[PDB]
Amino acid sequence: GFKQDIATLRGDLRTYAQDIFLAFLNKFPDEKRNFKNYVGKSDQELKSMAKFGDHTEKVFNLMMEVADRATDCVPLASDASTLVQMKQHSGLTTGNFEKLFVALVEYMRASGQSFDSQSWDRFGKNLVSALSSAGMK
Numbered sequence: 001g002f003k004q005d006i007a008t009l010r011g012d013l014r015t016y017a018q019d020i021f022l023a024f025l026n027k028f029p030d031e032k033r034n035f036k037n038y039v040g041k042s043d044q045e046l047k048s049m050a051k052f053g054d055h056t057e058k059v060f061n062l063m064m065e066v067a068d069r070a071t072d073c074v075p076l077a078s079d080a081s082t083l084v085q086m087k088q089h090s091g092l093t094t095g096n097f098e099k100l101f102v103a104l105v106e107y108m109r110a111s112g113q114s115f116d117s118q119s120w121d122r123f124g125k126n127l128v129s130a131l132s133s134a135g136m137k
């Protein structure tokens with residue numbers, strides 16, 4: 001289930017973080033507007049970039065904490081507020097987060113592993129709702 005998936009992702013987090021974030025950037029190419037440093041590079045090139053590895057790891061470290069602190073896939077309001085107020089997230093809208101979780105869920109469904117993809121879909125929808133409640137447009 002959801003709680004085991006958090007453990008699975010954490011057990012190989014740098015790899016999952018890079019592969020899911022690449023799935024996001026490749027499924028939604030326009031999202032690179034927010035990550036100009038990753039324009040014009042193949043996946044293998046990004047996976048050799050220190051900034052790419054460190055960004056994706058820090059993102060998924062925090063995402064897994066938010067997932068771990070949720071109850072029944074409902075995130076804490078404090079975690080939603082943090083994500084909205086982070087200076088790095090100024091100007092983002094909830095659609096950006098919807099797209100990240102669409103890619104995450106599709107990655108899980110295409111994976112050979114028994115991820116609880118429906119729970120991650122629900123978690124993403126509930127996080128989007130909480131971000132909106134916390135003031136993200």
Ligand code: HEM
Nearest residue numbers: 031034035054055058059060062063088089092096097100
């Ligand atoms: C639950 C989802 C997300 C989490 C947990 C998260 C977390 C983080 C963290 C921890 C950082 C600091 C690492 C760094 O500065 O490189 C960061 C930066 C950033 N995030 Fe997110 N983020 C999420 C979703 C998004 C989405 C959907 C977007 C845009 C589509 C986005 C855009 C950015 C940008 C532009 C930065 C600054 C990157 C840089 O300057 O290197 N984030 N995020």
